[PDB]
PDB file of C-alpha atoms in Angstrom:
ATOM      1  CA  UNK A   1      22.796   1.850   3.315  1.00 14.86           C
ATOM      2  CA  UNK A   2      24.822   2.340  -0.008  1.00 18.08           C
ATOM      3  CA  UNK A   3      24.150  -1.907  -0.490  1.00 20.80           C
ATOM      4  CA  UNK A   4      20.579  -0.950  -0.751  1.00 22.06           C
ATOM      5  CA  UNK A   5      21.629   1.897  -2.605  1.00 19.91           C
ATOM      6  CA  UNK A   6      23.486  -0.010  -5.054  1.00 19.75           C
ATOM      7  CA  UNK A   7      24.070   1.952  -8.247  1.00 24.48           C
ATOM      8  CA  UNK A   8      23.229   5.439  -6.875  1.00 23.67           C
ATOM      9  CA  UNK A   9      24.067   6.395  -3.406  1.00 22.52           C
ATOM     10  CA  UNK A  10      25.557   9.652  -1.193  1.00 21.93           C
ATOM     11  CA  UNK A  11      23.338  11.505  -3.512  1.00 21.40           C
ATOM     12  CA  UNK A  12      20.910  13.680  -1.565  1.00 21.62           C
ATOM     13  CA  UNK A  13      18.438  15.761  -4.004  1.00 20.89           C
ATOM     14  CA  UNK A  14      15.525  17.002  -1.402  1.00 19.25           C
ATOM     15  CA  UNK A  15      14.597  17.001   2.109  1.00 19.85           C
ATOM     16  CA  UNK A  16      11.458  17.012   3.368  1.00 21.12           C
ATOM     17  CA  UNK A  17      10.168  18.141   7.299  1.00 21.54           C
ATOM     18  CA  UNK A  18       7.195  17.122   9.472  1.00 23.27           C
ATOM     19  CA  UNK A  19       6.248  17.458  12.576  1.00 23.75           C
ATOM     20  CA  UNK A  20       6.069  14.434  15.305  1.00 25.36           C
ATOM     21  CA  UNK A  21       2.923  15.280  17.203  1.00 26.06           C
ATOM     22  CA  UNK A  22      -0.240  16.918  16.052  1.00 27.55           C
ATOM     23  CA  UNK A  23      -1.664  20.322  16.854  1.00 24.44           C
ATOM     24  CA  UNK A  24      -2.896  23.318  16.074  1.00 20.31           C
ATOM     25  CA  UNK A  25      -1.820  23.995  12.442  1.00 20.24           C
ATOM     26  CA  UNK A  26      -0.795  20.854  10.404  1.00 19.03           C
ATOM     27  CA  UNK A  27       2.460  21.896   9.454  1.00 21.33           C
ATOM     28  CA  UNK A  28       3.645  19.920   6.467  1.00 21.31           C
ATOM     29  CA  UNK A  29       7.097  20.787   5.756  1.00 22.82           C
ATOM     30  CA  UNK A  30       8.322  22.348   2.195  1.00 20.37           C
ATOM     31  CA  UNK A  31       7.374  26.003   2.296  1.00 21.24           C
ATOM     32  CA  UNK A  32      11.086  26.824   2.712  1.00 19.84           C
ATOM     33  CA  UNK A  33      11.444  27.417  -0.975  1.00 17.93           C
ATOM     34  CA  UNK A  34       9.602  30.134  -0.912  1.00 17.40           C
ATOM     35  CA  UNK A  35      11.615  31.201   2.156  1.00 18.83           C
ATOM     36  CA  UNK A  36      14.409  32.510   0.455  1.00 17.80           C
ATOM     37  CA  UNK A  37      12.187  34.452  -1.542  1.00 22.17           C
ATOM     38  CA  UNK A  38      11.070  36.221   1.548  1.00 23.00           C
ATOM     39  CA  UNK A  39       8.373  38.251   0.170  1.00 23.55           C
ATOM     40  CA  UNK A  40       6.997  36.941  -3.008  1.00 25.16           C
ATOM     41  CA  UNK A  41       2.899  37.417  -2.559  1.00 23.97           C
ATOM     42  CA  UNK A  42       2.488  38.617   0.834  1.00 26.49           C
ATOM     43  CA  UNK A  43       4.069  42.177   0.376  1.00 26.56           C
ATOM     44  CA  UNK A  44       1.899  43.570  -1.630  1.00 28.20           C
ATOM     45  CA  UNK A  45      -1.393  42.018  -0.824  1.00 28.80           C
ATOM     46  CA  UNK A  46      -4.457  44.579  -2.221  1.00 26.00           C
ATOM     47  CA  UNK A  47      -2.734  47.679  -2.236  1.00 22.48           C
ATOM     48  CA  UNK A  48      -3.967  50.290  -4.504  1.00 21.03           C
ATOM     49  CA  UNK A  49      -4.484  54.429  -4.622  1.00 21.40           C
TER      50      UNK A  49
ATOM     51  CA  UNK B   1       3.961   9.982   4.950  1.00 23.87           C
ATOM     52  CA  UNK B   2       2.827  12.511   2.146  1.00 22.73           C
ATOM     53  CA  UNK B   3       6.024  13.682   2.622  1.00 24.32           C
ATOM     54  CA  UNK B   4       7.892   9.865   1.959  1.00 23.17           C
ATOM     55  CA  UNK B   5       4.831  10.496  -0.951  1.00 21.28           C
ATOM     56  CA  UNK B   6       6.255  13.470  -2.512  1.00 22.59           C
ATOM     57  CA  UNK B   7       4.253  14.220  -5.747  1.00 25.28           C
ATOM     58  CA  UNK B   8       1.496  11.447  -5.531  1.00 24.98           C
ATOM     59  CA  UNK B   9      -0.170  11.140  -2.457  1.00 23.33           C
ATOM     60  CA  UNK B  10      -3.288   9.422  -1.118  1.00 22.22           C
ATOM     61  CA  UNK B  11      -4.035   7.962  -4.076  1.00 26.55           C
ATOM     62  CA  UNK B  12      -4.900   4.134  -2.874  1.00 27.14           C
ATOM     63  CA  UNK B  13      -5.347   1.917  -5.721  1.00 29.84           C
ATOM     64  CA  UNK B  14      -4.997  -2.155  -4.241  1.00 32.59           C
ATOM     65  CA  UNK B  15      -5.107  -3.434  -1.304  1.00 32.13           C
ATOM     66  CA  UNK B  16      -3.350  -6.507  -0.765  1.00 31.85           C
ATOM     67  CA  UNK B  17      -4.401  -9.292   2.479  1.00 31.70           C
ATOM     68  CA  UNK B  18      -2.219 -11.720   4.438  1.00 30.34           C
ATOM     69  CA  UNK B  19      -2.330 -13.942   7.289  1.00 32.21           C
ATOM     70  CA  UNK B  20      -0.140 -12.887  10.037  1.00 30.92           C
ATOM     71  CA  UNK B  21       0.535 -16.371  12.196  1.00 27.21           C
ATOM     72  CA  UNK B  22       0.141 -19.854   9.528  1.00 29.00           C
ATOM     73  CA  UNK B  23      -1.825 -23.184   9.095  1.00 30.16           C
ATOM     74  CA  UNK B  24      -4.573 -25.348   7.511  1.00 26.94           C
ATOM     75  CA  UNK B  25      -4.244 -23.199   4.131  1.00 27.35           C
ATOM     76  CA  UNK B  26      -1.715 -20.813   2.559  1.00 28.51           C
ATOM     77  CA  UNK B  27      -4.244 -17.755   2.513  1.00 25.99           C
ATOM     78  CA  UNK B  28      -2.443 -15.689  -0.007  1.00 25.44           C
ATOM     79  CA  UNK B  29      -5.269 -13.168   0.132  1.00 26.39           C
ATOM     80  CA  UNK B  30      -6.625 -10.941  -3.322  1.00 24.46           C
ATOM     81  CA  UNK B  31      -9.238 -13.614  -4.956  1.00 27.19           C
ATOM     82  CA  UNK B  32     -11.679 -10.785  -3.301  1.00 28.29           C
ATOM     83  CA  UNK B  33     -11.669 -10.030  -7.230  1.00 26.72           C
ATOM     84  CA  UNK B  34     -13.462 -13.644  -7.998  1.00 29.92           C
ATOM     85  CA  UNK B  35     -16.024 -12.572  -4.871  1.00 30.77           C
ATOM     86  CA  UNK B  36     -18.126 -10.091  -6.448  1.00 29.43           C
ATOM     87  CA  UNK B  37     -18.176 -12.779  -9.699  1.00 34.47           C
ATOM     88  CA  UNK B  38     -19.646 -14.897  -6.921  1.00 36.15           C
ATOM     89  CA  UNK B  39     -20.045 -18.048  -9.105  1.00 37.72           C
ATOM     90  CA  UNK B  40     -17.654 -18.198 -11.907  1.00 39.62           C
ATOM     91  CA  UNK B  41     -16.286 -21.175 -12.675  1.00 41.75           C
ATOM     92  CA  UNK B  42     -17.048 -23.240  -9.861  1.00 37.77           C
ATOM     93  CA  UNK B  43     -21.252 -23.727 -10.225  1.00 37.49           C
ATOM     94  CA  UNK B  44     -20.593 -25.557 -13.430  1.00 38.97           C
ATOM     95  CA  UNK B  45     -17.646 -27.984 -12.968  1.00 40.20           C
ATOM     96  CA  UNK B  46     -18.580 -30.685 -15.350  1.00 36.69           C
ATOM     97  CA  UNK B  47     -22.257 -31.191 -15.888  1.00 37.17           C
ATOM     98  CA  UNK B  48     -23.568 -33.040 -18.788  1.00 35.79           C
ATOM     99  CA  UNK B  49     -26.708 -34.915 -20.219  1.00 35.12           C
TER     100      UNK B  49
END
């Protein structure tokens, strides 16, 4: 796998997740960056006095 | 696969043909785009008065 490599290999930038089967939501994979960021939007969602 | 995809995704733009088992003729299939020009070289091969 580092012959097709050739010039660049053992270099990993991004990972991406899906899910196998299919069902109920569609669940493509690369919400995890706003994961760390636990509560970005969703905190404060229409709060006002 | 839009995953694999990353930024582009679904965004078909050719569509190449082949033959899967071979014979008779090579079938090397994309002269689809000499179809729809249904007739363009081959009605006049080498007619002359």
């Amino acid at each position: 796998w580092l012959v097709m490599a050739a010039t660049c290999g053992g270099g990993s930038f991004g990972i991406g997740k899906l899910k196998s089967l299919c069902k109920e939501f569609s669940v493509p994979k690369e919400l995890r960056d706003a994961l760390r960021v636990k509560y970005g939007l969703f905190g404060g969602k229409d709060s006002l006095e």
